[PDB]
Design a protein around this ligand. Structure first.
Ligand SMILES: Cn1cc(-c2cc(C(N)=O)nc3cc(CN4CCO[C@H](C(F)(F)F)C4)ccc23)cn1
Ligand SMILES: CC(C)CCC[C@@H](C)[C@H]1CC[C@H]2[C@@H]3CC=C4C[C@@H](O)CC[C@]4(C)[C@H]3CC[C@]12C
Ligand SMILES: CC(C)CCC[C@@H](C)[C@H]1CC[C@H]2[C@@H]3CC=C4C[C@@H](O)CC[C@]4(C)[C@H]3CC[C@]12C
Ligand SMILES: CC(C)CCC[C@@H](C)[C@H]1CC[C@H]2[C@@H]3CC=C4C[C@@H](O)CC[C@]4(C)[C@H]3CC[C@]12C
Ligand SMILES: CC(C)CCC[C@@H](C)[C@H]1CC[C@H]2[C@@H]3CC=C4C[C@@H](O)CC[C@]4(C)[C@H]3CC[C@]12C
Ligand SMILES: CC(C)CCC[C@@H](C)[C@H]1CC[C@H]2[C@@H]3CC=C4C[C@@H](O)CC[C@]4(C)[C@H]3CC[C@]12C
Ligand SMILES: CC(C)CCC[C@@H](C)[C@H]1CC[C@H]2[C@@H]3CC=C4C[C@@H](O)CC[C@]4(C)[C@H]3CC[C@]12C
Ligand SMILES: CC(C)CCC[C@@H](C)[C@H]1CC[C@H]2[C@@H]3CC=C4C[C@@H](O)CC[C@]4(C)[C@H]3CC[C@]12C
Ligand SMILES: CC(C)CCC[C@@H](C)[C@H]1CC[C@H]2[C@@H]3CC=C4C[C@@H](O)CC[C@]4(C)[C@H]3CC[C@]12C
Ligand SMILES: CC(C)CCC[C@@H](C)[C@H]1CC[C@H]2[C@@H]3CC=C4C[C@@H](O)CC[C@]4(C)[C@H]3CC[C@]12C
Ligand SMILES: *[C@@H]1O[C@H](CO)[C@@H](O)[C@H](O)[C@H]1NC(C)=O
Ligand SMILES: *[C@@H]1O[C@H](CO)[C@@H](O)[C@H](O)[C@H]1NC(C)=O
Ligand SMILES: N[C@@H](CCC(=O)O)C(=O)O
Lengths: 766, 765
């Protein structure tokens, strides 16, 4: 039985009119839903196309529909006629065959060598999408793995990340979950479990897989991509265990009462994906008005009439039976067949328009039909409104670059409040864009939660996030970083200068130091005022002595020695007042100079004055006493410059501890460096002690002779009190400076009382 | 439509390129005399020896269904539909197995067609790497290895002759495309590249082949070329090259090989070409069978009449339209007969199919040695899976028992790679192919090839090897060819592509990876020339010794009390630092001494002039005044520059040449600023001369005052003469600077002598 219609262009066709049948017969029982319902749809669409003024106005199309009873071998033998005729009916320009995963594969493999374009209407296999093996194959139905994009978009819209994926044994579940994971990666979505619900297993295996899915509470959403029976069994197993989930269904479980019946409690907010199909207002009317007598075009219509009504033509009893009275249920894959045949017609019209301009009929250049150009350039680039539309938004009939037609999916949600069960409600659609309506979804309404499945938790702040992921990168588990350090990157928290606080609030890792100079008034106002008062008093005393330095200088110690004493005490007071300064190398070196030099000169002048008395008890040499004192000071200055060049003076970055407020008060000078000179001042103190032990007293300077011992004792006491203080206050900075200033002021006051006070008393007496 | 159909229990198919475009315009007008007819006769000889064989298929006759292909994949697909005509269910004949085509594209197409119908296929000459894929070519097999081993052999021979930069051209068919990519991979593995790559197709030689030849001639630097292109295109390419007078050394694949039909009348362009052909042992039985063939007894081959007409120009039974009538006394003798290399491959394929069929018959009919009803329907899938891919038998006609005798099938239904190396040569005036190598997984080329110019043709002359000491890579036009221009003028060039400068004060090493900083010229300057000022320093030491002598009279109660005791010692202090000043300048320019250098020069010069001015002008005020100006000058310079510039010597003064590093960088800047200080220092010195030049003339020291004026007069002239030499100081950092400071030392020594001259005069008198 071969269906042939007269026409200028003949279109091929392969439909499963008969079933697989037994081993004895190649073709068994006649299929009245998938082989004759689609065949009549193709015939009706061809007739309407031939009666369309805007679609091939002059050229009338024909048909060469064949039968493949769900057998790959039989389909191959039938399709061999298509390639044999081209090399005797009209050459088959296009084939609208292909209704099975393997039949379409065989037809495409056979027809690719002879370059015959083919658009399938019911083949959802993903293996045909590989164009490296199937060059001239197309299809109107979207492939099964195209729902992965819709699933990922839905999960991203609901902010679901820690999802669970369930696959199948066949090419349906596998080839979907493969590249469903890939689409999940592009959406920042991780897969928690990859259990495979495949072949037939006992209820124990179903309980095991549902237990493995439920073993972690972080994954409250599962993505089922299995067949209807597998989904039904999984729902039954979940209901038996009484688990709660938000299963994201697929085309296997879409708007089906045989998959959710008996498991209403388990599934209450499951997202269901179903392919969108619209009824045809004219195909049903055409199908009712059909009889086996007038409709002699279909050779298999007699068998359909005999089997459907359980009658036969030998008794002449089938006349009473009618098809209009019997209710008609349009198959889902009828609009797809209509779209496929209309796409072939549109491609032929484009060929005629862009190849035979001057001829409205079949031009001569169209006689040697070539499938390569006709397929590649035109079939994959057709864009026309879907025929017989219900005036919806499904007017997009296009083919991708991989020969896969676009598809629109209806996102159903299983409601249960309206009627208890069987309330599949459409809450959106997927047509090149997600259009979910959260108002109809119960848990999306503002009276519940999104029932989320978040990978661990992300409550961490921007400055206190480490993103340390033990096993799940999507978890973004954070560990609190050091409070004294900022972060280098959001994904990886790195300590940026943990010693001092950086600009964490500014997102930068640059440190922010605080210049806490030793200027605090609490520990400075007193000592600074005391030092200033002492310096002013010393300057006034020196000026008063200098003004009347005529009679007393010659009688008392030499004027040069008195000037040396005045300069020494003035330098000591100046150093005490200037000890506080910014942490700079210049301030450090000036302090290192003065602190030693002033003391050294002030005691060297006293020693030289005692040396004059010692000489009385080489030569006295009044003019050389100043030179000797200057040499004594210069020796200490040489020691100071040596310990200043060998020490490499500098300014410390900060005197603050490892973790505390930033402060910079330390200097490059060390305790050993200080003691290096302190040995020389200890030698000077010993010399002064020996001079005091030389107790011979001049009648004019009787008080001064004993005052030398008092000065030596005061200096010894100050040193013996400062050394334990220096050891204790080594870490302290403000206390050490105050103690040093107090000691310097005390030494200056002692020297002033030793030297100027008798002079002031003598001046007042005179 | 012409075919050879023989009835029998089992029928073996056949696809040969009998018809091919030779000298004409038709796509397959001419007849192949070496590729199609020879292989067809080899298959017929194998079949009719198997039919009479007793140890192989006893009692079963093997038929043939040999067809034509016209060297086209579409024609092969159209004509191969008769192999599946009997499987539907000019009488259909059931084909047990099909012998594969001679071309990679044809074999691929027939394999794709026969995979659906489950018909085993064994090829004899389809060497393609695109095949052997068990995902799209399930029902396919071949006795020949793929193009991978051929590409490896080509890379090996190219590396053997040091051929690096070559020109490449291939075909657009399924054979050229994959083989050329394999060649690119195997060439980039061995660090050799190609000039350009061209793809040709089955078309007229006016445009495509002419453009290819012109482009190849456009780059004379590359002489050796490779040919991953089919024989039918190879003949036309050779003809075009001969028309254009080509001068390249072709490296051919198995497509051309040792075929003499490609080159006929154009042997001067293919001279010296190195062609690759599969190793094969000639069959003496096939040679005798072909030599015994006659036009009359060979009624089985429809194409034999055309083959005889093309081989010998005469009419077998036609009229006198041809240029001669056949003499009826000539045959295919050894003088003009050359057995094709790929004949034992066809024989092995036919015998392997026969062995598989015989073993399947034995295992399916153990009781009787005859075809049974169970074997009436043939399962090609099972046959190919087990009884064809797992066959092991000795070669049908081989007097040896070596490795090549055993015929096996790999996991992919492949063969072993032993491509022979053939070189076109002219010996005795007769052009012929001579074997010069054998690729038994190791290249064994012998030095016997006769090249085009009687010498080893060189290549890669555009990019010759160069020493990396100064050369750099530059690729203006092509990535491969580079010019080794001399770069890096005393700079590091670790990167071969680009050369960049080390920078100031850096000298590259021999490795050109790390620039080394040369030692400073100023440092360690005490050996040859800086010892000059050391003698001045020794003279300064003598001046210091003189400074020791001058105060001896002043220490021992000098009689002349008119001169101030404090003033006399004050001026001696100034001259003392001047002698000690030159030591710092000639010492190591350490950061500590740079600050001390300016202090030493500034303070000593100021106090020396200040003391003289105070002496010229009771005695308390001159002492205080001298210290006042000396203290003010010392204090002012402290807070002006040294406390602000923060002098720190470093590498500098390298702009003139990279082989020079001055140890002072910030200190050198202070030296430039010292010129302003020097003018300021001499400003007060010059002012002092005018202020007290024969103005006071105190009678107590009139001679001393007049002498003191002379000291001021000679100092300004000496100081002024120092200015011109300070400008050229920067030219010689370690030479001029040392001599520049000698002027101050010389002035100090002169000042001491004249100032103390009246004092020493009294001592002498
Ligand atoms: C009678 N009397 C002498 C002085 C005196 C004098 C001098 C001096 N070289 O002219 N330098 C002093 C340094 C210091 C600091 N110390 C603290 C840190 O550690 C070190 C040590 F020695 F304390 F361990 C140093 C303290 C007192 C110094 C003051 N009063
Ligand atoms: C270490 C330092 C600070 C010590 C003091 C250095 C300076 C200020 C000293 C050293 C020698 C001193 C001079 C020595 C002698 C005299 C003579 C007298 O009739 C007046 C003061 C006068 C002119 C002194 C002034 C101050 C002086 C110049
Ligand atoms: C070296 C560093 C500290 C810079 C200071 C250099 C000058 C100013 C110093 C260094 C050594 C010093 C001398 C050391 C010893 C004596 C001997 C004495 O009977 C008179 C003073 C005299 C002659 C000093 C004068 C000043 C002096 C020359
Ligand atoms: C001694 C009197 C008469 C003259 C004055 C001499 C003075 C200027 C000399 C004597 C010893 C010298 C020091 C000897 C060694 C060093 C260490 C070196 O790394 C830096 C310079 C330095 C620190 C010298 C500075 C100048 C110096 C202090
Ligand atoms: C400050 C120290 C360390 C270095 C510099 C030392 C200088 C200032 C010293 C060294 C020798 C000193 C001189 C030594 C002797 C006399 C004679 C006296 O009747 C007046 C002061 C006078 C003229 C001194 C002036 C100051 C002097 C020049
Ligand atoms: C060479 C440089 C550093 C210094 C130049 C000036 C020198 C030579 C001067 C300056 C100060 C002078 C000293 C001042 C005072 C005295 C004390 C007297 O009882 C003996 C001489 C003596 C010890 C002098 C020796 C010479 C002296 C050291
Ligand atoms: C008593 C008289 C002769 C003393 C004269 C001062 C002498 C001892 C001083 C004056 C200048 C000094 C030099 C100044 C600078 C340097 C560079 C340093 O890297 C090593 C020490 C060295 C080389 C010093 C050695 C001592 C020195 C020569
Ligand atoms: C007696 C008097 C005149 C001596 C004065 C000596 C002065 C000018 C010398 C002695 C040691 C010197 C310091 C030694 C080392 C350094 C570190 C260097 O990175 C900057 C300069 C600096 C900080 C020098 C500045 C000048 C300095 C302080
Ligand atoms: C030659 C090199 C080492 C530089 C030496 C610089 C020395 C000699 C300079 C630098 C600063 C000077 C001092 C600056 C100020 C005064 C105060 C004045 O009332 C007496 C002289 C006196 C005390 C100077 C003595 C000489 C001095 C110490
Ligand atoms: C006579 C005795 C007692 C005191 C002499 C004080 C002299 C030596 C002091 C006074 C001012 C000081 C200078 C002040 C500031 C700086 C800048 C700093 O970056 C290096 C040290 C340097 C250049 C100091 C060197 C020593 C200095 C010249
Ligand atoms: C998902 O999260 C985004 C914020 O990242 C929010 O704007 C959106 O409303 C969320 N979707 C829901 C709650 O369905
Ligand atoms: C190739 O070059 C090498 C040196 O790099 C040389 O030893 C060898 O003989 C050359 N091969 C030839 C000239 O065939
Ligand atoms: N092996 C080459 C040609 C073999 C031949 O026919 O000589 C191919 O696959 O096209």
């Amino acid at each position: 039985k071969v269906l042939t219609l007269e026409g200028d262009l003949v279109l091929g066709g392969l439909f499963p009119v008969h079933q697989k049948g037994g081993p004895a017969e190649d073709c068994g029982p006649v299929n009245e839903h998938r082989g004759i319902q689609r065949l009549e749809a193709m015939l009706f669409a061809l007739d309407r196309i031939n009666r369309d003024p805007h679609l091939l106005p002059g050229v009338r199309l024909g048909a060469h529909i064949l039968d493949s009873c769900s057998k790959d071998t039989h389909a191959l033998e039938q399709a061999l006629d298509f390639v044999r005729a081209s090399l005797a009916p009209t050459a088959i320009t296009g084939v609208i065959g292909g209704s099975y995963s393997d039949v379409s594969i065989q037809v495409a493999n056979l027809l690719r060598l002879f370059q015959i374009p083919q658009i399938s209407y019911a083949s959802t296999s993903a293996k045909l999408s590989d164009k490296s093996r199937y060059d001239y194959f197309a299809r109107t139905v979207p492939p099964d793995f195209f729902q992965a994009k819709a699933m990922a978009e839905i999960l991203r819209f609901f902010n679901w990340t820690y999802v669970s994926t369930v696959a199948s044994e066949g090419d349906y579940g596998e080839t979907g979950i493969e590249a469903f994971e890939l689409e999940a990666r592009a959406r920042n979505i991780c897969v928690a479990t990859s259990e495979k619900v495949g072949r037939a297993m006992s209820r124990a295996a179903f309980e095991g897989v549902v237990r493995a899915l439920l073993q972690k509470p972080s994954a409250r959403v599962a993505v089922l991509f299995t067949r209807s029976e597998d989904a039904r069994e999984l729902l039954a197993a979940s209901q038996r265990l009484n688990a709660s989930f938000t299963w994201v269904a697929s085309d296997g479980w879409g708007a089906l009462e045989s998959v959710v019946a008996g498991s209403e409690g388990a599934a209450e907010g499951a997202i269901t994906i179903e392919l969108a199909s619209y009824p045809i207002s004219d195909f049903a009317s055409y199908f009712q008005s059909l009889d086996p007598w007038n409709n002699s075009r279909n050779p298999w219509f007699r068998e359909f009439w005999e089997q459907r009504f359980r009658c036969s033509f030998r008794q002449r009893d089938c006349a009473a039976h009618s098809l209009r009275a019997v209710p008609f249920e349009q198959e889902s894959k009828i609009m797809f067949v209509v779209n496929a045949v209309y796409a072939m017609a549109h491609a032929l019209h484009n060929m005629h328009r862009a190849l035979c301009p001057n001829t409205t009929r079949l031009c001569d250049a169209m006689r040697p039909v070539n499938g390569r150009r006709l397929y590649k350039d035109f079939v994959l680039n057709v864009k026309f409104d879907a025929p017989f539309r219900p005036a919806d938004t499904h007017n997009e009939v296009r083919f991708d670059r991989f020969g896969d037609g676009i598809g629109r999916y209806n996102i159903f949600t299983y409601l249960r409040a309206g009627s208890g069960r069987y309330r599949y409600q459409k809450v959106g659609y997927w047509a090149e864009g997600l259009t979910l309506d959260t108002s109809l979804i119960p848990w999306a309404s503002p009276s519940a939660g999104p029932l989320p499945a978040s990978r661990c938790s992300e409550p961490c702040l921007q400055n206190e996030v480490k993103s340390v992921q033990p096993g799940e990168v999507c978890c973004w588990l954070c560990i609190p970083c050091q409070p004294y350090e900022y972060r280098l990157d959001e994904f990886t928290c790195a300590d940026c200068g943990l010693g001092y606080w950086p600009n964490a609030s500014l997102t930068g890792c640059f440190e922010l130091p605080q210049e806490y100079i030793r200027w605090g008034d609490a520990w400075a106002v007193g000592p600074v005022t005391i030092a200033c008062l002492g310096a002013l008093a010393t300057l006034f005393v020196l000026g008063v002595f200098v003004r009347h330095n005529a009679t007393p200088v010659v009688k008392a110690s030499g004027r040069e020695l008195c000037y040396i004493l005045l300069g020494g005490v003035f330098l000591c007071y100046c150093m005490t007042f200037i000890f506080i300064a910014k942490p700079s190398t210049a301030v450090c070196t000036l302090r290192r100079l003065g602190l030693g030099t002033a003391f050294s000169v002030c005691y060297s002048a006293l020693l030289t004055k005692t040396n004059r008395i010692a000489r009385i008890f080489r030569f006295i040499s009044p003019a050389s006493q100043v030179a000797i004192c200057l040499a004594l000071i210069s020796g200490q200055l040489l020691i100071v410059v040596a310990w200043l060049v060998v020490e490499a003076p500098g300014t410390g970055k900060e005197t603050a501890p490892e973790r505390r407020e930033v402060v910079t008060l330390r200097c490059n000078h060390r305790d050993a460096s200080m003691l290096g000179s302190l040995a020389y001042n200890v030698l000077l103190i010993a010399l002064c002690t020996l001079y005091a032990f030389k107790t011979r007293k001049c009648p004019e300077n009787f008080n001064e002779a004993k005052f030398i011992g008092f000065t030596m004792y005061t200096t010894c006491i100050i040193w013996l009190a400062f050394l334990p203080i220096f050891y204790v206050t080594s870490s302290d900075y403000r206390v050490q400076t105050t103690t040093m200033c107090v000691s310097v002021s005390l030494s200056g006051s002692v020297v002033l009382g030793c030297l100027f006070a008798p002079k002031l008393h003598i001046i007042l007496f005179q | 439509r012409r075919e050879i159909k023989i009835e029998g229990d089992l029928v073996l198919g056949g696809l040969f390129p009998i018809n091919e475009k030779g000298t004409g315009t038709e796509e397959c007008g001419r007849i192949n005399e070496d590729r199609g007819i020879q292989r067809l006769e080899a298959m017929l000889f194998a079949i009719d020896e198997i039919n009479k064989d007793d140890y192989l298929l006893p009692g079963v006759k093997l038929g043939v269904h040999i067809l034509d292909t016209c060297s086209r994949d579409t024609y092969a697909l159209e004509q191969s539909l008769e192999f599946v005509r009997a499987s539907l269910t000019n009488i259909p004949l059931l084909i047990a197995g099909v012998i594969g085509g001679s071309y990679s594209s044809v074999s691929i197409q027939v394999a794709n067609l026969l995979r659906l119908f489950q018909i085993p296929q064994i090829s004899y000459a389809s060497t393609s790497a695109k095949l052997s894929d068990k995902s799209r070519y399930d029902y396919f097999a071949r006795t020949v290895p793929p193009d991978f081993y051929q590409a490896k052999a080509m890379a090996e021979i190219l590396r053997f002759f040091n051929w690096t930069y070559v020109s490449t051209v291939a075909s657009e068919g399924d054979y050229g495309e994959t083989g050329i990519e394999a060649f690119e991979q195997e060439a980039r593995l061995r660090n050799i590249c190609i000039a350009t790559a061209e793809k040709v197709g089955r078309s007229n030689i006016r445009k495509s082949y002419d453009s290819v030849i012109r482009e190849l001639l456009q780059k004379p630097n590359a002489r050796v070329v490779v040919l991953f292109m089919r024989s039918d295109d190879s003949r036309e390419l050779i003809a075009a090259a001969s028309r254009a007078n080509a001068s390249f050394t072709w490296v051919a694949s198995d497509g051309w090989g040792a075929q003499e039909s490609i080159i006929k009348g154009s042997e001067h362009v293919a001279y010296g070409a190195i062609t690759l052909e599969l190793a094969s042992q000639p069959v003496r039985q096939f040679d005798r069978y072909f030599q015994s063939l006659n036009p009359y007894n060979n009624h089985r081959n429809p194409w034999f009449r055309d083959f005889w007409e093309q081989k010998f120009q005469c009419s077998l039974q036609n009229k006198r339209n041809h240029r001669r009538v056949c003499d009826k006394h000539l045959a295919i003798d050894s003088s003009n007969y050359e057995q094709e290399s790929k004949i034992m491959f066809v024989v092995n394929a036919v015998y392997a199919m026969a062995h598989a069929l015989h073993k399947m018959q034995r295992t399916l009919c153990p009781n009787t040695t005859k075809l049974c009803d169970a074997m009436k329907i043939l399962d090609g899938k099972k046959l190919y899976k087990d009884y064809l891919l797992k066959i092991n038998f000795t070669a049908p006609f081989n007097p040896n028992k070596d490795a090549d005798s055993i015929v096996k099938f790999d996991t992919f239904g492949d063969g072993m790679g032993r491509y022979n190396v053939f070189n076109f040569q002219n010996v005795g005036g007769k052009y012929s192919y001579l074997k010069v190598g054998h690729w038994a997984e190791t290249l064994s080329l012998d030095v016997n090839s006769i090249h085009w110019s009687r010498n080893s043709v060189p290549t890669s002359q555009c990019s010759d090897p160069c020493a990396p000491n100064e050369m750099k890579n530059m690729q203006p036009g092509d990535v491969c060819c580079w010019i080794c221009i001399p770069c890096e003028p005393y700079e590091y060039l670790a990167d071969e592509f680009t050369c960049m400068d080390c920078g100031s004060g850096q000298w590259p090493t021999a490795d050109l990876t790390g620039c080394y900083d040369l030692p400073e010229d100023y440092i360690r300057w005490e050996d040859a020339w800086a010892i000059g000022p050391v003698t001045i320093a020794c003279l300064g030491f003598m001046c210091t010794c003189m400074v020791v002598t001058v105060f001896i009279k002043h220490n021992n109660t000098p009689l002349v009390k008119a001169s101030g005791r404090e003033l006399c010692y004050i001026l001696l202090f100034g001259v003392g630092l001047s002698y000690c000043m030159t030591f710092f300048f000639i010492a190591k320019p350490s950061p500590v001494i740079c600050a001390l250098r300016r202090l030493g020069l500034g303070s000593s010069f100021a106090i020396c002039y200040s003391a003289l001015l105070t002496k010229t002008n009771k005695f308390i005020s001159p002492s205080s005044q001298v210290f006042i100006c000396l203290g003010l000058i010392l204090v002012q310079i402290v807070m002006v520059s040294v406390w602000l510039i923060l002098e720190a010597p470093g590498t500098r003064r390298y702009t003139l040449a990279e082989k020079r590093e001055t140890v002072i960088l910030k200190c050198n800047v202070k030296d430039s600023s010292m010129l302003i200080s020097l003018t300021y220092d001499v400003i007060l010195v010059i002012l002092c001369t005018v202020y007290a030049f024969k103005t006071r003339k105190c009678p107590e020291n009139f001679n001393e005052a007049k002498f003191i004026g002379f000291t001021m007069y000679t100092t300004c002239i000496i100081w002024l003469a120092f200015l011109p030499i300070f400008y050229v100081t920067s030219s010689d950092y370690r030479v001029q600077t040392t001599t520049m400071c000698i002027s101050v030392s010389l002035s100090g020594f002169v000042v001491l002598g004249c100032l103390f001259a009246p004092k020493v005069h009294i001592i002498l008198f």
